[model samples]
Target: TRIALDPFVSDLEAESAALRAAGPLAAVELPGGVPVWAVTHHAEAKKLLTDPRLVKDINVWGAWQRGEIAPDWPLIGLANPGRSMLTVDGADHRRMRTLVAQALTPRRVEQMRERITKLTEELLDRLTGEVVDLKADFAYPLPMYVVADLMGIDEARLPRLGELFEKFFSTQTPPAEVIATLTELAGIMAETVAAKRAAPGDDLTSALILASEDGDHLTDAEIVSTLQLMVAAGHETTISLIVNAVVNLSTHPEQRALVLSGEADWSSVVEETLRYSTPTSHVLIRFATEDVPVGDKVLPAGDALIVSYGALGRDEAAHGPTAGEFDITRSTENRHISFGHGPHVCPGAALSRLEAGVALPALYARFPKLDLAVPAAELRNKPVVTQNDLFELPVRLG
Candidate 1:
């Protein structure tokens, strides 16, 4: 039986609590004849993430290519599962992650703190109390600008690139449109590679270009693919998180007061925002390479498994009793799997955290009275993307 639990409709905490109470694993039938084991508890989810036996290749079920499977499947080359560090396992995953990891290292992310703060201020300057859509004015534009600058994409091409990405990542759009966007993106990437080769600069795209020189570790195609992945993955999730953080804070006045009063630490606030309202509602589906025993269930080989990180964060056992509550001061030892786990853990996590940490504070500082212009009930939560749960968040600045 196909079970569809749209997180957007159900109370997030209540649904997660019920799932955790159900046990560690449960059989779930998704669209397109794919059966999956849903791992809900923290321990089980973590174990499943790190378990080599539970592989990451979506093609194991042959559903991704036909767009019958998960999000961003048909446009694989955009993320190019083959080139992505998240899809591969063992040595290849480690090697690729390590090569670009420096760009997202803690220190490197910290260095960008000032830059992110400045960017946030600049974006905020454009907004007025006349009721601006937060997603367009602040949230979406900020991260896309950051990633575009990082990748050295011409500012002139940003509008087109942004529109293409919207179509590419959007599951609501037809699969044909998504595929066409990916094809156009690939052609654009080819041109970008040539331009970067001709004249390199001090940017991540330039760094990738340099890494591919002489083909010691990565190929030109690999570099282009990596850049594409960075542009797509790096911007979308962070943008959603920022908007969610703002929306959550706006709705929860006590929380908003605490953050604005400078009583709450920015890092803890970001963590709470991630745990309380994670942008990504579902984990990337992973397939089992062989039979794996999870809890009382023995999932068969070749079966797909989805570890819901959104559910796991609210698992009582994981956060030690106060899991459902959003407490910035809570001493929760367990790290939320918002960044996934094991080798496929998000390499851009530190950078994302840094971006939000810098942006949120600057945002509130700029508009201390920032608030949603519309009722929360009217706001649309996109559940199909699995990772993103928001479309447009309309807000007003004071």
Candidate 2:
């Protein structure tokens, strides 16, 4: 049975539950009527994620090869992203990933703890306003600033980033708007790269610029594309992370109070929430190089596949009957593909985790009485299907 992957689903969790009910490897009809396969089970998803036959080459996609996919397609950039680690496989992926991993490994992420703590304190001060949208003034800016600073981007260019991203993730964007936003995104990165070239700094972008190889030094366009990928991926996912953590805490008061009372650790809350409320709903567009076995079905070569992390995190078959329950104590045995699995697992996971660890604890400590201002049902999700992000998180800092 084919399940329709609606971008505007009224309830994301209900939709994800239906997907899991469909089967382990469900046939999916994506937005714009594209047909693909979704790995809905945690076990199946982990296996296929590292399978050699599931290649990242965009050209292998049947729709893309036949020119059926339009540039203005809401998720075009993600599907046919340029020559980066995201779009490549094997040796090329390894080389590009090595550079980034070196700059963001666990040890390297430690140095960021101080900055994140300082930023949390600064952001907390602004919560004095009677009512607050945590998604905006806090969650949105934290990751953006962290990534932008890491890439040596000017803080002022953030407006341009948001303007372009708003279009990139919207389902209702016009064709010209899509083209314009893509161009603007590239230009923003190009300008930042040129500025970094003139005066390098202790930032990732500057380091990438200076790193060279045997006729394989990253070109200007590559640098721009990499930065664009970082901002969209690294920044956006973390925003969803922080927001979702708050949502889970605000909605589950008993659990919230457990952590608030120090009976449970913040790390456990972070771990549990990552499993219960993953930010990355569905990662898109992996092409099958050959017939790939998924339970009783075979994903035909040239077909695209989506790893439904949202569904996997809720699969009772994998995590037992209580998988759907959000319990901080569950962290003791937490296992999830929220950051994905295998070689292509997100490199910025540590960075995102650190921000959430610092931000969520400090938030509760500062606003001990933080409570959801609106009913949980009243909170709505953004139209984009990739990131499981809310439109806004209205709360009172009591």
Best by TM-score: 2
List TM-scores for all candidates, in order: 0.87, 0.92
lDDT by residue for model 1 (136-255), tens: 778877877777676667778888987887787666778578669888887777777788879987667666655522354656777777877777777778988888788778777887
Tens digits of per-residue lDDT, candidate 2, 68-152, equal 8776675776787667768887888877776666545587576778888988888888776767998887887787667766777
lDDT of 2 at 41: 91
Worst 10 residues of 2 by lDDT: 328-337
Model 2 misplacement above 4 A: 67-72, 155-178, 212-216, 331-334
lDDT value, residue 103 of candidate 2: 49
lDDT of each: 0.72, 0.81
* Model 1 deviation from the true structure expressed as Cα RMSD, one decimal place: 3.5
Model 1 residue 154 lDDT? 78
Residue pairs in collision within model 1 = none
How much is the lDDT of residue 26 in candidate 2?
88
